[PDB]
Design a binder for this molecule. Structure first.
Ligand code: J6B
Ligand code: MHA
Length: 216
């Protein structure tokens, strides 16, 4: 039976919360979080991978003007690697590609998409695989103003995805089922950079509409 709750933060699969700053790089933070999870599972090592590597080098994406996580995973597979943050640090602006194979810290052998809208399939992937990259509607002030408890707003638009984040678990709080979401807006946002978002409530904020994970 799939567990009632999963929390990758408790098992050492999740790096500290980052700040994307004034750059449309949410997709790169989402991507590296899912890669970091699979790298720890596979090799036993938790380390920061380079979102700047993805911003500068994923030519199917638009760098600081936005991207998709599936394009990030495809790049790491075709490039035969991604650098560590230490080798290729985040500066929050586009520059020409500085990928160096000597800084290589992970590889990718493809990716898988969660069937669109299917919150049970997303739950099974989080339980069996690890942290999963997800897209949400994060446009409401209620989301901006989150501090505690399970986030639900009937005005969230499941059809208008505009933010990429990382699902690092799920569970239930005082009878409210939730997703555990890592954001890239710094530790001073939300609950130390995290938000619990309503689970099995009409696919709230589109959480299962564009979910994916890398294969290693
Ligand atoms: C998973 C999704 C929802 C994430 C979303 N993704 C896109 O919005 C997106 C935008 C652009 C392209 C693209 C790829 S190639 C190209 N262009 C090439 C030629 N030039 C001429 C035009 C642009 N554009 C893309 F793939 C995707 C995103 O990153 N966003 C949404 C924005 N609100 C930003 O805020 C949060 C995040 O920091 C940014
Ligand atoms: N059945 C379990 O141990 C599930 N765990 C979480 C996990 O395994 O990620 C529950 C908890 O830590 O409260």
């Amino acid at each position: 039976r799939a567990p009632d709750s999963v929390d990758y933060r408790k098992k050492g699969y999740v790096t500290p919360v980052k700040n994307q700053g004034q750059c449309g790089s949410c997709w790169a933070f989402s991507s590296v979080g899912a890669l970091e999870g699979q790298l720890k599972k596979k090799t036993g090592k938790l380390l920061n991978l380079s979102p700047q590597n993805l911003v500068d080098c994923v030519s199917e994406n638009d760098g600081c003007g936005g991207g998709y996580m599936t394009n990030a995973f495809q790049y790491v597979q075709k490039n035969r690697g991604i650098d560590s943050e230490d080798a290729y640090p985040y500066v929050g602006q586009e520059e020409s590609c500085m990928y160096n194979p000597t800084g290589k810290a992970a590889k990718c052998r493809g990716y898988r998409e969660i069937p669109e809208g299917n919150e049970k399939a997303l739950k099974r992937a989080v339980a069996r695989v690890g942290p999963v990259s997800v897209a949400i509607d994060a446009s409401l002030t209620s989301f901006q103003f989150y501090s505690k408890g399970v986030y639900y707003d009937e005005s969230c638009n499941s059809d208008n995805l505009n933010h990429a984040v990382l699902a690092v678990g799920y569970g239930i709080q005082k009878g409210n089922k939730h997703w555990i979401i890592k954001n890239s807006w710094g530790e001073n946002w939300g609950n130390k950079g995290y938000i619990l978002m309503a689970r099995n409530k009409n696919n709230a904020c589109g959480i299962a509409n564009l979910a994916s994970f890398p294969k290693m």
